[PDB]
Amino acid sequence: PQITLWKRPLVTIKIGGQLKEALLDTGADDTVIEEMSLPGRWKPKMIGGIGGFIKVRQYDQIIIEIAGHKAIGTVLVGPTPVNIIGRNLLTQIGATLNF
Amino acid sequence: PQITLWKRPLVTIKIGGQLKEALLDTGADDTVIEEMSLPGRWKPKMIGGIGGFIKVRQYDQIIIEIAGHKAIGTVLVGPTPVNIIGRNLLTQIGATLNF
Ligand SMILES: CN[C@H]1CO[C@@H]2OC[C@H](OC(=O)N[C@@H](Cc3ccccc3)[C@H](O)CN(CC(C)C)S(=O)(=O)c3ccc(N)cc3)[C@@H]21
Numbered sequence: 001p002q003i004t005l006w007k008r009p010l011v012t013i014k015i016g017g018q019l020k021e022a023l024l025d026t027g028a029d030d031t032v033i034e035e036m037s038l039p040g041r042w043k044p045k046m047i048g049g050i051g052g053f054i055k056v057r058q059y060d061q062i063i064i065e066i067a068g069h070k071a072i073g074t075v076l077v078g079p080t081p082v083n084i085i086g087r088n089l090l091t092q093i094g095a096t097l098n099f
Numbered sequence: 100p101q102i103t104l105w106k107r108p109l110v111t112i113k114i115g116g117q118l119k120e121a122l123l124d125t126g127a128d129d130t131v132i133e134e135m136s137l138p139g140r141w142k143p144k145m146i147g148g149i150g151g152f153i154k155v156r157q158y159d160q161i162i163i164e165i166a167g168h169k170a171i172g173t174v175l176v177g178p179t180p181v182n183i184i185g186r187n188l189l190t191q192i193g194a195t196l197n198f
């Protein structure tokens with residue numbers, strides 16, 4: 001699909017058995033989701049944005065379905081105000097910016 | 100052009116006759132750039148991101164070139180960690196997300 005940017009590019013994701021709304025965010029290196037449980041090992045990480053840093057849990061090799069396209073990669077979990085799909089998973093679904 | 104997301108989507112912008120690097124950011128509603136002087140009056144705004152909120156100066160109707168495409172619109176100036184081109188000017192340059 002082609003998504004225009006008049007409005008926030010929100011899509012439905014499926015992660016950890018749950019449906020969530022998330023923002024397709026080319027300015028995010030990493031995918032960051034609101035607090036939830038995920039299986040397997042994790043390690044702590046700090047990630048910074050506008051406003052400073054938050055502490056997150058880093059889970060590797062997590063499968064997500066993004067607008068119907070499956071991808072696997074690292075997912076950061078913590079107190080983000082918005083669920084964000086970052087470049088680490090946008091590449092896997094073949095997303096590009098075009099102008 | 101078609102920009103893939105394996106690396107950060109950085110482009111050259113020109114504002115006040117100066118070249119700067121900035122990130123094409125579909126997760127940003129608004130364009131915000133690091134401290135610089137812009138002409139005219141400004142109005143207050145708060146923008147929130149991953150770590151919380153910052154105060155910025157809002158300048159309207161600023162001429163800015165983005166990857167060679169001319170735009171004229173609102174630029175926020177404040178302590179952002181990186182220059183970000185958000186959806187208000189991405190729509191002016193005709194950008195879409197595609198997958
Ligand atoms: C530096 N780590 C960063 C980079 O990679 C990592 O992945 C996740 C984080 O990325 C980010 O937070 N990306 C943001 C851009 C941004 C901000 C600061 C620095 C770089 C990029 C976002 O793309 C845009 N942000 C709203 C998101 C969180 C809903 S906003 O806070 O900046 C914003 C920018 C304008 C406006 N008008 C309002 C908010 C880590």
Ligand SMILES: [Cl-]
Nearest residue numbers: 072073074088
């Ligand atoms: Cl990854």
Ligand SMILES: [Cl-]
Nearest residue numbers: 091094103104
């Ligand atoms: Cl590719």
Ligand code: NA
Nearest residue numbers: 040041060061
């Ligand atoms: Na894992």
